[PDB]
Amino acid sequence: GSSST
Amino acid sequence: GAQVSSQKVGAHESTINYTTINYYRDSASNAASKQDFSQDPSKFTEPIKDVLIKTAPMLN
């Protein structure tokens, strides 16, 4: 879905 | 598979973000993230066997 760094 | 990261905002008009999606199977095709690490210069600047204490005499 989504990775958030 | 979207990757969301923050920009370091320089001139201004909360955190501003940007999105990245890899379109190819080969990591070589990917753009550069620029999310890089730093390290201490020591292996080049203090390569000595006995740790240097800067207030102390370097030679003792």
């Binding site: - | 292996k43 390569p47 030679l59 003792n60």
Partner: protein, 268 residues
């Protein structure tokens, strides 16, 4: 230490050999990496390695050279300088592949009334420039590899003009570090300085460095040792002072792969 221990006084022991010094300026470990054997996760040739341990990892002393007012500098290559040193040299020429780290100990004492300073540099891949301006990359194997005598630096580039029978040797100009870069910057390579008022030796512990885990020691030199007079020798008012410089070097954690018959190189 209050029990006498000093940065200037060291003892090094490898195999059946010991070096003592009473005037060191600490010692250097290149890039902070101590020598190691090749790890399984980085291994490449699959045959059982030969590890000669104390038989080869011991201090070998090379031929002593002489430092004078006219000295421009000296150079050596590793493993080349050790190719004829006891069982290290034997193990080297019997195998296709070999890797090794080194303790390099440069020795030069004088007196409180002498002065001068040697920059001692260990350079990974110390490629040196040739004598020709009609051809590039043409220094012969024989001239590239002096063995223990090493070579020297010069203050002047002087091109080989015999085109019939070219000299095919290096012409390494000192202020250009023999490779077209300025000597004042050689300090980014692991180094020590023998400044005669301060210390009488330099000690460099070198890891095996290469773009491979193991390689042909006979085809390729991993490290170069360059010694140059940063400040010239001087003593009292003698016009012609001289003091000796001795190199003692020990292989460390060396291992060899690909055993066969011994290599007999064309060295002259």
């Amino acid at each position: 230490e209050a029990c006498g221990y000093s940065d200037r006084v060291l003892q090094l022991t490898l195999g059946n050999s010991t070096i003592t010094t009473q005037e060191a300026a600490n010692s250097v470990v290149a890039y902070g990496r101590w020598p190691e054997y090749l790890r399984d996760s980085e291994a490449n040739p699959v045959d059982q390695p030969t590890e000669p341990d104390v038989a080869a990892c011991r201090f070998y002393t090379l031929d002593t050279v002489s430092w004078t007012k006219e000295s421009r500098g000296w150079w050596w290559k590793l493993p080349d300088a050790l190719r004829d040193m006891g069982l290290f040299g034997q193990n080297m020429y019997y195998h296709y592949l070999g890797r090794s780290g080194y303790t390099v100990h440069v020795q030069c004492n004088a007196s409180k009334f002498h002065q001068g300073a040697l920059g001692v540099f260990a350079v990974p891949e110390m490629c040196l420039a040739g004598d020709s301006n009609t051809t590039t990359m043409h220094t012969s194997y024989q001239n590239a590899n002096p063995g223990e005598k090493g070579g020297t630096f010069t203050g002047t580039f002087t091109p080989d003009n015999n085109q019939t029978s070219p000299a095919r040797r290096f012409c390494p100009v000192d202020y250009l570090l023999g490779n077209g870069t300025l000597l004042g910057n050689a300090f980014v390579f692991p180094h020590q300085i023998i400044n005669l008022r301060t210390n009488n030796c330099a000690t460099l512990v070198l890891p095996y460095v290469n773009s491979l885990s193991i390689d042909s020691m006979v085809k390729h030199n991993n490290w170069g040792i360059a010694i140059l007079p940063l400040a010239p020798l001087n003593f009292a008012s003698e016009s012609s002072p001289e003091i000796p410089i001795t190199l003692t070097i020990a292989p460390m954690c060396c291992e060899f792969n690909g055993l066969r018959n011994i290599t007999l190189p064309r060295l002259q």
